[PDB]
């Protein structure tokens, strides 16, 4: 563990094709990356939180505990296993945004 870092699985909705896939997310500094899985050598995408305008809870999904990250180019919809896990991600992400 390292303060400011977090890694774990989250389910996310696709862009054009809105299928939900379980991906491994890692947060270090201001980079939020997601991989196919925990042992994936390379990320599918590297998101820079300096471009993120907000992180908010999302109550409009099929999954109960979801939140989204808003970027000018796209809003990502992610869901955690529990409200607790969702809160952990939301709190650390907002914390990141607060220092930006
Ligand atoms: O796997 P299928 O059912 O074909 O649907 C894919 C996955 O949801 C992708 O997620 P992942 O990349 O995690 O595999 C997603 O890319 P994102 O990563 O941008 O969400 C694609 O969005 P579009 O490329 O926008 O259609 C979507 O077409």
């Amino acid at each position: 563990p390292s303060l400011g870092t977090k890694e774990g699985y989250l389910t996310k909705q696709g862009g054009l094709v809105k299928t939900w896939k379980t991906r491994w997310f890692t947060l270090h500094r201001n980079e939020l990356k997601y991989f196919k899985d925990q042992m994936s050598p390379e990320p599918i995408r590297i998101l820079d939180l300096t471009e993120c305008s907000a992180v908010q809870f999302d109550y409009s999904q099929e999954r109960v505990n979801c939140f989204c990250l808003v970027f000018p180019f796209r809003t990502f919809y992610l869901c955690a296993k529990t409200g607790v896990e969702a809160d952990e991600w939301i709190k650390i992400l907002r914390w990141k945004l607060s220092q930006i």
Side-chain angles (χ1 to χ4, degrees), residues 7-62:
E7 308 189 330
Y9 285 104
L10 290 178
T11 55
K12 54 166 284 294
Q13 184 175 67
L16 295 178
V17 178
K18 302 181 180 180
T19 50
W20 286 78
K21 301 293 177 181
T22 309
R23 298 290 179 250
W24 176 254
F25 286 72
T26 65
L27 175 60
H28 292 276
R29 310 186 192 302
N30 289 315
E31 296 203 314
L32 181 65
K33 301 173 178 179
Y34 61 84
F35 304 69
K36 289 301 182 188
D37 62 63
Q38 186 174 357
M39 299 309 283
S40 292
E42 299 298 321
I44 289 170
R45 194 160 186 168
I46 300 179
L47 299 175
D48 189 319
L49 298 180
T50 65
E51 304 189 283
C52 181
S53 64
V55 298
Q56 37 186 286
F57 308 92
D58 188 336
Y59 305 106
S60 69
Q61 303 308 326
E62 289 189 55

Side-chain angles (χ1 to χ4, degrees), residues 55-90:
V55 298
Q56 37 186 286
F57 308 92
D58 188 336
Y59 305 106
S60 69
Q61 303 308 326
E62 289 189 55
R63 289 176 180 58
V64 295
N65 308 110
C66 309
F67 56 101
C68 60
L69 312 182
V70 185
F71 292 82
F73 52 90
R74 171 177 174 182
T75 291
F76 292 79
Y77 302 96
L78 316 179
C79 303
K81 297 174 56 181
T82 57
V84 167
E85 183 177 57
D87 277 347
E88 283 170 19
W89 275 105
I90 288 159

